[PDB]
Structures are given as C-alpha cells and as structure tokens.
What we know:
The structure is cut from a larger assembly and holds eight protein chains of seven kinds. Chain A has helices spanning 33-36, 53-65, 88-92, 143-155; strands at 45-47, 68-70, 83-85. Chain A is mainly α and 158 residues long. Chain A has a two-stranded antiparallel sheet with strand order 2-3. The relative contact order of chain A is 0.06. With 148 residues, chain B is mainly alpha-helical. Chain B has helices spanning 2-21, 27-38, 42-55, 60-72, 76-89, 94-106, 110-122, 127-139, 143-147. The longest helix of chain B has 20 residues, at 2-21. The radius of gyration of chain B is 19 Å and the shape is elongated. Chain D is an all-alpha fold. Chain D has two helices and no strands. The longest helix of chain D is centred in the middle third of the chain and has 20 residues, at 9-28. The radius of gyration of chain D is 14 Å and the shape is flat. Chain D starts with 8 loop residues before the first helix and ends with a helix. Strand 1 (45-47) of chain A pairs antiparallel with strand 1 (29-33) of chain E, so a sheet runs across the interface. The structure holds one RNA strand of 97 nucleotides. The PDB classes it as splicing. The entry lists the keywords mRNA, splicing, intron lariat spliceosome, pre-mRNA.
Amino acid sequence: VHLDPAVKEVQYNPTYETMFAPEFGPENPFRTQQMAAPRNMLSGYAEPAHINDFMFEQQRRTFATYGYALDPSLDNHQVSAKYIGSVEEAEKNQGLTVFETGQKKTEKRKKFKENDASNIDGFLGPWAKYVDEKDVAKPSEEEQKELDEITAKRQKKG
Amino acid sequence: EEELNDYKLRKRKTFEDNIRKNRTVISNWIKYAQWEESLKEIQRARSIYERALDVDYRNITLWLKYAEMEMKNRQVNHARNIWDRAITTLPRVNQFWYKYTYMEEMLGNVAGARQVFERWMEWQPEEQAWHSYINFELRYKEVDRART
Amino acid sequence: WEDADFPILCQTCLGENPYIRMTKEKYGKECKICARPFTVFRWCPGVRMRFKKTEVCQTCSKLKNVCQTCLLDLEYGLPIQVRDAGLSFKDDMPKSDVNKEYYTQNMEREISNSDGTRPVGMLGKATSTSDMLLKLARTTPYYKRNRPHICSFWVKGECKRGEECPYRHEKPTDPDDPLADQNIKDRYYGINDPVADKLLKRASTMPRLDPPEDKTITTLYVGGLGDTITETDLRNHFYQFGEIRTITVVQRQQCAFIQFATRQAAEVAAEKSFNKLIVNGRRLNVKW
Amino acid sequence: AKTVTKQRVESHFDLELRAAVMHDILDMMPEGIKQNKARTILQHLSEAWRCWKAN
Amino acid sequence: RVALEKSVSQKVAAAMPVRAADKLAPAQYIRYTPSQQGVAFNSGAKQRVIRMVEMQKDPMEPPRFKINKKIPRGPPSPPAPVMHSPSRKMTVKEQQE
Amino acid sequence: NMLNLLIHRKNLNYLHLDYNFNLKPVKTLTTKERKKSRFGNAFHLCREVLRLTKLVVDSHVQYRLGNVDAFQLADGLQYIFAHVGQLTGMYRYKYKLMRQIRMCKDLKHLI
Amino acid sequence: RKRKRGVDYNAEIPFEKKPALGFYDTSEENYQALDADFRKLRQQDLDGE
Amino acid sequence: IMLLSGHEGEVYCCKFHPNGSTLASAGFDRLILLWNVYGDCDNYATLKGHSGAVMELHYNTDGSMLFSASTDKTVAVWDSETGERVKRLKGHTSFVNSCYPARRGPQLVCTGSDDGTVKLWDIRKKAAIQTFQNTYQVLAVTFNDTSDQIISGGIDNDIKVWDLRQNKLTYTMRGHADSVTGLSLSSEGSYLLSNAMDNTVRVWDVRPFAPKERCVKIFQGNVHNFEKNLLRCSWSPDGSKIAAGSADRFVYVWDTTSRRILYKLPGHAGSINEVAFHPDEPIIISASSDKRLYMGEIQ
RNA sequence: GUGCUCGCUUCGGCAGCACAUAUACUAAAAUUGGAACGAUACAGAGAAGAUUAGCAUGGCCCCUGCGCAAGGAUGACACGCAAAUUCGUGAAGCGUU
Lengths: 158, 148, 288, 55, 97, 111, 49, 299
C-alpha cells in the first residue's frame, strides 16, 4: 500500500503488507523481454553477494566434473530445491561432490614407473608418460592433400 | 565527380581552417553555409548553422540566414522550428516576431498568427508591437476585438 | 577512460555453468572499434572452451545494444544488420575516424549527463516488435560457437604436443566459402555481413499473403476450426480487425466463411491471420 | 601553461593592457551602438603612446 | 570533503607512481540476474553467481597506450534564454556624438 | 639490451652502442638526423653509470679467469674509484660530480 | 594517401549536429536533390561572379 | 535503523544481554565483540581466547556469564564485566556446534557436537558428568525449562529428548525431513521452535501432556541454500512472534497466532545466520554472512 | 601417490580410512595493417627600398628535451577579390486611371 515502487534506501522498517503487496493495473505491451526484466545495468541485475568461499568453489568444481550442481538462485520458487543441468546423473551418482570418495573407481590408465633416481637417463618420477597414446600424430593419407589444397588456394589470393 | 569532390574538399578545408583560426568571426560560417546552399546540399547547410549557434547563439543575423534558407526550399516545418526556438531564447529580438507572423499571414493562417501575437503580448512588448496587432484586427474589420 | 565493474554479456558467451570465475583487468586492451582503453574481463565459459574475453567497451556495446564479445543482440541473439533492416532502421554514426572521435565524445557527454543505463535513444527510433525478428531469434544456446580454435600445426601435418592438444583437430571451413571473410567492424556497423545475408534471404522465402489480387472478394476462409470453437470466439477476433456482417460455417470442412465490409479491413485482418492465429489451442489455416 | 619567464614580459604586458581596454569600450558604449569601431579606439591609444614618447 | 579528498587522492596518486607496488586482494562475489531468462540458457537456474578477482599488475610494464592524442572538442550545453528588459530607444543625436 | 632497444624503437639505426657503452655514429649525419638523435642528459647519465659497473665487474672477471693476480685486482678497483672522471666522463652530463671527484683525489693523497 | 585528415569531408556530412525538432513533425518533408547538369556548369559558376 | 560493521568474517551468532542494555556478537573471525545497544552503538570488547570459529553465544539468565561454543573443541565461559575467560571445558573430540545453559540454578551447561555425543557439564567440575551417545552429528541442543531434560536436534532429522534422571531416551518427535539446524525454547518453557533444512519452521508442544502428534503449527517461507549453514531460530520474549534465519537475505518474523509474515526486511547481502529480539523494547537485530549486523525498531 | 589397517593375507593384487583438491594473455603458429632515415627531379625563408635581433598571439601541426628550462627560419602555418540585419532624396523621358 503506502510505499512507492520507485523507492531506494528506505529509512524506516516497512511491514510486509505495506511493501510486498501488488502493483495494480494492466501491463503495457510496449516493452520487450530485456525492457521488462528488473535490470540495474544494460543486460541485467548485478548485486554484491558474500557467499562462503568453500561452498562456491565446491559446487563450481562439481559441475565441471559431472554436469550437475545445486541451484544457486535465491528466489525462483521458495518451495523445493533442485539440481540443474544433466539432472539424471545427480540421482544416479547419489549427489556426491569432487571432495569425496568417488563411487566409480575403474579403468585407470597405465604408465611407467622407475622411482629410484640412480640410473641416469632412466628416471621418470611424476613425468611418466601413459603407455598407449603416443606422440607425432597426423590425421590422414588424404586429408593432408585437402589441407594442401586449402593452403594453395590461400596462395592464389595474395 | 572526383573534381567535384576535390573542389568540395579544397573549399571545405579552407573554410574549416579559417573557422579553426577565426571561430569568433561568425561571417565565415555564413559564407560556408551559403556555398552549400548554392550546391543545394541542404543537409550540410543545416548542420553548419546549428554548429554556428553553438558558438554565438545571440547573433541575430545568424538565425535570419538559417530561417530564410528553409523558407525558400519550401521546408515550412523546419523554418517553424527555427522561429519557435528563436522566440524562446531571444524574446526581446522584435524582428523575429514580425517575420514569424509575416510567414503565417502570407500563408493565410490568420488563426496561427494570433497565437504568435498572443504569446508575444505576454512579455509586454513595446508600443509599436501592439499597434501591429491592433492593425491586424483592423485589416479584417474586427472592431470589437480591436477595442478589447 | 571507461571504467566499469561488470561486462555486458549474453547467456551464450557467459557459459553453461552458473558458477563463473572471471578476472578483472583495468585498461588491459583497446576497444576493437573506438580504440579507447577499457576494463577487460576474462572467463572460462565451460569445461573445454576458448577462455573468452570482452572485445569492445560498454559505450560501443550500449549504442548497438550488443554483447561485448559476440556482438549479437541482447534481445534476440541475431546480428546487428538483421535487427536494424527488419525495423527499416539505419544508423547515422559517421564512418570516418576523425568524425567518429567527435561523435564518441558527444555520446560520452550524453551518457554522463543523462541516466545513461538505457538504449532508449537508439532503441526509441524503432521500438516496435516485428514477426520477422521473433521467428528468427534463438530460443536456446549455441555452445558450439564457444569451441576451441583449430590447431595450425595440425593443418601443417606435423602435430607435435600429441593428444594433449587443446585446439581442435578437424577440417577448417573452405576458403572459397563467402562466410569465412568476416570482420568485427563489418559485423558491428552491419555492412556486407555474410551471416546476415544468409538469414535475410532464407527469411524472405517464408510464406506470405498472396490472395489480395482478387481485389473485390472480401470474404476470408479459415480452416481447421474443429468442433471446439464457437461463432462468438471467431467473431470477437475478427471484430478487432474491423467491421463485419456475414458468418457462415461448413461443418464437413470444419471451415468458416466470414465477410468484411471492406477488403481493406480484410487485408488488415489477414496480417495477423497467418501462423500467429491460435484459438482454443487450435492453430488455424487462413485462405481466401 | 608556459610561463612569463623573462623575455616574454614586455609582449605579455602589452597584451594585457589592450585586453583590459577591450572590456571597458564594450561596457562604456550605449547598448544601441553599432557593434564595431573597437579596433579604431585601440589605434588611438597606440598613437597617444607614441606622441607621449615623442613629447 | 569525502567527495573532494577522494578526487584529491586520485590526483595525488599520480605524484608518486612507483614508491611501492599496490596491494590488491578484494576478491568479491556478485550475484547476477541475466534479464533474458529461459529454461535452456543457464542450464536451468534463474540466476548465476560470479567470482571477481582483480588481476595482478606487472610492476615493470610501461604505459601501454597513447594519451597525448588531441580530439575535436564537443559542442556545449543548450543555450540559456536571454532574460533582458526591452531594448531602450537609441536616438540619432547621441548615435552621432 | 635496454639502451639498445631504446635506440631501435626510435629506428635511429645509424647509431651504434658498443659493449663498453660508447655511443658512436656509423656515418656523418644530416642536420635532421643530428636533431632526432640528440638524447638528453637523463639517457647519457644512465649509460655512463653502466660503464662504471662494467669496469668494476670485468676486473673481477679477469681475476676469476686467472689473467691477473689478486693483488692486481685490489689495485685495479682502487684505481677505478680514484679516477671515475678520467675513465668515464660522467661529469659532462651532471656537473655536481666535481664534489665526489675531488674527494676521491683527497682520499688518494691521504692513503 | 598518407594523411590523418582531409578526405573525411567527402564521405558524409562531417559534423552532423542534427536540427532541433519539436511541435511540428518534419521527418516527412524532404528536398529535391541538386540538378547536376555537367555540360554547362563551370568553376566560375559555382563560386559566382 | 543501525548498522554494525567491523567483523572481519561471517557473523554466525548474536544475542542481546538479558537486561537489554548491551549486545554480544561473534562469528568466523573468532572474536566476540560486545556492543552497547543505546547511544552511538559503540564497541567495548575483544574476547580473544578461541582458536576456531565461534558457533553460538548464550548468556546466563542474570547476564554475568557469556557462553561460547566453538569449532576449536572447547566451550569458553567469560565474565561479562571483566572479559576474563573464567573456564575452558575441553572434553569434546570434534567441533562443538552448540551449547545452552540451564534456566534454573545450578550453573549446568549442555553441548552438542559432530562427534555424535551429547555431553552434560557442571561448571564446578572439569569433566562431563553424563554423555548420551547419538548415532549421528548433533547441530543444536537446548535444555527444557525445568533444567532436567536435554533436547537435541541433529542431521538424523528426528528430534530427540533425553532425561538426565533415567539416563535414557524418553520420547522422540518425527515430522521434519532434514537436518535440524536450530532449536529454541520459549520463555514460558511450553513450546520449542525448530528450524530444519527442509524449508519449514515448526512449533512443537514440549509440555508433558501434549497430544500424540506434538506438531502444533507449521510455518513456511525461509530458504536453505547450498552453503548449508546452521540457520538459527529465536522466540520473541512475549511468545507472540518468532524469527528464523534464512539464506535468501530476507529477515523473517511471523505472528505465531495468525501464521502470517509480519516483516520481511531486505538489505543484507548474505545468508542471515541468526535473528534476535530485544527483551523489553521492540528492537530486532539480524546477524548475516555479509560481515554486518543490522539493528532496527519494529512496531 | 605415500602411510596405517591385529584387511583379505601374501609379500603379487585389491578394498577402506587419513593427509594431499583445479595451472595456463591457453601456440613450437597461420594472419592483418601501418611505419624508417634518405636519395631522385621539384622547393627558397617575416616586418610596406635594402640588410636584419627578435618577443608575442591561435590550434584535429609536430620534432628534440626529465622538465612549469631552452632550441627547432621569429619552428611551420596565419597575408585575406577581409561586403552582416535594413533604406530613402531630387529632377528628366516613356506608358496607365
């Protein structure tokens, strides 16, 4: 009721009923999607959070490893929490994070080890290469020729 | 077209160099605007007058030259906007009021002319201005209004 | 110099993960258009991608109303040339460098004195929505845009660094394709943008109101009504277009014939009455 | 903003004299005067100075 | 004074540029509502949360850009209406003297 | 490398800076080149300071190579600091060094 | 061409301060272009007598 | 409205002193800052004795003693006049999430920890008198009014009530779906307020003669986010209003009778961990993770 | 990966727990434009006759210099058919009411 909608920096404590009650009247049709959203700057609403460093960083890491995360938004519907993204793997992997003992632990890649540092030109501690997938890749007998064409076609321009 | 553009470029550069050196010499602006007017490049001429107003808006002769150029080319609404701006910024320049009414009178907009006259009388102008308004009604025999 | 605390960025650039780490570098690079230094923000948009950065300052971004990185439009994600041409709009901003500098300071003066948080000066010239833009606009991301660059050594055929290689090992687009020759300036001003041209030609082929050459029939046919739409529903919609007096319905076709007092009203009616027309959840086909 | 160090002194002062006289001649004229002949008044000052030196 | 002393400090910061490195770690979070909401765009969420870190300026890097380049100055503010009294009648006799 | 890059950045490539921080020109200059290459006292002071380091450091190099006795090294450094005017020309570009240059002569006489 | 200034006055209206605009609509009215007539016009004719 | 900056970290807990004239605040910075309520709201303490995060503050009913439960595995007892750490109870193997001192004398204290133990104390003795072993972590404990019962809420969702005399679990309450971050008992002792991570605040009949279903009232409208903080709950002194911490930055006060919101006050930037009422005047303080305390009059 | 597991239970493998928890202007490149004297022809230095010290003034002109010093021909340029609003007298001839 008694509080302006065009308001900032309210000096007193307004009651719920005198601040959250609706604006009356019909909406205009003359406003596009960007124009109707409550933006503070040209693309959206930016406001300073103070979210705890360990919890931000954990969830952020979690999405990169799997593709699910717990929703950071702070209104949406105030009713029930959900995961986001590939939600099927959230229920599947029992909602773990990276900072936990994983459920899957299989099919590890194999590498050399010569942890002695006594044979010169034979030591490789943490610089060990995987044994299967190996240096000096080139993609084809014939794709090379097609890339030769493309570089030749570039020569015809200049 | 190249010789025409080179003639344009050479002349404009000499005008701009003279304007950069002699900004307060308003007569340089008029020469440039009149040269574009001779080329009928009205869109360039318009911008020269507006830029010239930014240096000395009070120069009466500058407003006149701008308004005259629009009237000649039948761009009546552009000229109206120039007169309406002029009377708001420079109400004491009597000449503007007379010329504005004179446009409406030639166009036969006897009604519109009155509005310019009525808004003028609000400022309480000199005696001679009133007589022009009186004579306006007298030319059209509205004796009872002339009385009021 | 432009010092801003947050970059104007679209959702596709911003990334698929809602937890973002980004670094703020004051005056790190010059703006690709106006050459003024600006605050550069750089972020990793996802698991495998380019680790993007802002290319143009917010000033240039405000004027067009575009994302600082991709330069696609914050309302639709289309390119600038498509959006302005659809509204028959044109930009008066000068093309030569010296006059552009003059114009730059003017807009700086305007944004500093006005509210400045708004496109509304440039948007105000053409605020109207158009059916062309709403059809073309992306409803969904295009993350493929974000994918890493092509490995130049791999194209040479001697790709050292092996399968570690974060750059893509796939064929580049053929140089004879006109779509390769793009320029940021040309995309920004909206001149000879090949991506725009492809869109506009395609969009032009979309169906349209052909019948009005029948200049003295004024009756509309509408098809697909079912049994689940009343006369009154139909009559209300047609009444917004104009003046009417005939309604007749053929139940075997499930079609109506409705006649306007003028063809002009009928043609005005037909403008809305395309694939936009939905009543009671049924989408209807309009004929003369 | 380069300074009036030493060699600049006499040329600077003669500018400030003439710039001051410009202000007075604008103010002293009645408001309906022909907005000219300012340069003519200055040339009389330069002549009066020369006559003073020559006695 | 708070308004001026701050602007003072930005001027005074020029006077001694190299007396020490600046120290900078105010790594702040801001919460953001993207305006152009949709079911697909954010992978689901209505909002996204962003960590801001000011990047470490290299002490030894010289000024990157040209500052001295002069530009044509923009036109002024819109002209104020002239509120004078009516032009009082000049006479021929005084005009001659 | 620093003073070398500063020359090449201005494309004054007709000047040469040698490994003992002399600057000499490879040809007779035009007036316009001679104007463009007239570095100020700030550049020349820093160059001559670097010369004074190299005379010190190379003396230590000569000793570590075994080309000179340790006793020769000591007399070498002593010679440098007494004679920095004669050996480096610094006082051309900053006249106040005639304080220090005198004082080293006094110390020379004293010791 | 090796110049930073010059040719810009041929590409567009150089310093297009728009006319002020209000109370009468005047986006509509527009003017006849210059009659070229490049078979009689002379350099003396553009400058005038 | 008054703003109280100056905590370097998250503010987990805040309590008014029982006489209303002074205020205590503490949190992630490990310091306990004592504020005057009236005048310029100035500070006049740093309490320094802890080595880890202060999880909860409680005064004794006369106000001479301040109790601070900490993640450092210790409970500190402070003299409010001098600021001396009077004693250090050091009996717990894991983080101390909560404490609460007895309403009636003697000076008993009870505690809940992540080691799954609920330990009773007596300030006279250096060791725990009794330990009840819960199967899972305990997030909040309070006494009842009669000082004979410990009520504990934990991550096992159920509310558990022990009896110190029989040394046995005596009744349990079921209905909450998630971890009970906060418990608080009304000044009359009849009712308990509970906050849980299932986005519900509830009032339970703690009296001996309750119906079999003890849940009397359910309140909604707070949010628990991904930080999973221990959002606390408090009663108004008259029992007419309840407050709950919420992670959506809004400060919630409900009317207990009408079950409506009455104030939903913006302005914090982070999760609000605890909200406290002043005992006599209608002043409310809310402690948030934005490193600020906001204090303001309500009507 | 390491250590501990009164772990299978051998010294082979696997499981659990504890500690340990997210570098990189991501290239060894492909590109894109704008620049350095200085030679080639051309080009000649202000003050009303001539030979000349200069100090100024103005700005999308710079160079040299650490400079709020000082030089660059007085650093160059400025040299201009330098026309801005708004009229009336007096007689003489011709045509019209």
